[PDB]
């Protein structure tokens, strides 16, 4: 049966070091956007092909954002959270002020919208 978003997330997580890193959140974003555009199969194929060519899994994930057309010139998704503390420890130092026109294929993984109005971009 078809690969699900959760299955793909787990496959990608299996290749990443650490826990709750910016790359883990990029997996989340790739899987959610991929699910919503019925593109999980090509995303998985690009991931596996990059690994097969010898790329690191980090590089494979970035290549997805540049080579799978749903991500080309796409803005990062907005994720609503309560406070900065909801964001995983390993992501904290990757949080930045949000620039004008952030793009996933330029390393802006997602934008966190905090409950008090603050906004932070997650950068790789
Ligand atoms: O319902 C699905 O089919 C599905 C598929 C793939 C991913 C997820 N997600 C989650 O279940 C989830 O917890 C999402 C995380 O990105 C997330 C969601 C909230 C807070 C945080 C934080 F810990 F980084 F702060 C992370 C994540 C997610 C949900 C909504 C939107 C995104 C997106 F904005 F694309 F990054 C990600 C859901």
């Amino acid at each position: 049966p078809d690969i699900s978003a959760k299955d793909l997330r787990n496959i990608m997580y299996d290749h990443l070091p650490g826990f709750g890193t910016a790359f883990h959140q990029l997996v989340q974003v790739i899987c959610k956007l991929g699910k919503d555009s019925n593109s999980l199969d090509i995303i998985h194929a690009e991931f596996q092909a990059s690994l097969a060519e010898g790329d690191s899994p980090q590089c494979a994930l970035i290549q997805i954002t540049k080579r799978v057309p749903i991500f080309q010139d796409a803005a990062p998704p907005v994720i609503h959270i309560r406070s900065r503390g909801d964001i995983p420890r390993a992501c904290q130092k990757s949080l930045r002020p949000v620039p004008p026109s952030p793009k996933i294929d330029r390393g802006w993984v997602c934008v966190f919208q905090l409950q008090d109005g603050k906004t932070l971009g997650l950068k790789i």
Side-chain angles (χ1 to χ4, degrees):
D2 291 346
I3 173 57
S4 75
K6 305 306 182 178
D7 284 5
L8 186 56
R9 172 175 70 210
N10 284 337
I11 286 164
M12 288 171 163
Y13 274 14
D14 283 344
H15 289 272
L16 292 177
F19 171 85
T21 72
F23 280 99
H24 292 85
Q25 183 58 22
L26 177 58
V27 168
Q28 290 276 36
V29 169
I30 288 171
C31 288
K32 182 53 167 48
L33 289 185
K35 178 190 183 190
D36 290 343
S37 296
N38 292 74
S39 295
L40 297 169
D41 179 278
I42 186 57
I43 290 162
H44 176 247
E46 296 281 349
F47 182 70
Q48 292 300 344
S50 287
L51 293 183
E53 286 308 307
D55 286 335
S56 69
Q58 296 87 352
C59 173
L61 291 167
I62 297 304
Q63 287 301 350
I64 281 161
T65 71
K66 286 151 175 296
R67 304 208 289 241
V68 181
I70 69 168
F71 301 110
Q72 295 163 11
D73 282 321
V78 175
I79 299 174
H80 283 93
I81 59 178
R82 294 197 271 174
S83 69
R84 200 177 166 143
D86 296 337
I87 303 168
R89 181 157 58 169
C91 280
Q92 290 289 329
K93 295 187 178 62
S94 296
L95 297 169
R96 305 292 153 71
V98 184
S101 307
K103 297 294 182 55
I104 295 171
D105 62 14
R106 293 205 248 266
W108 295 97
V109 175
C110 58
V111 166
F112 290 106
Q113 178 62 66
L114 288 59
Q115 190 128 353
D116 68 354
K118 292 177 161 56
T119 70
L120 287 174
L122 181 64
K123 181 61 163 55
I124 297 182

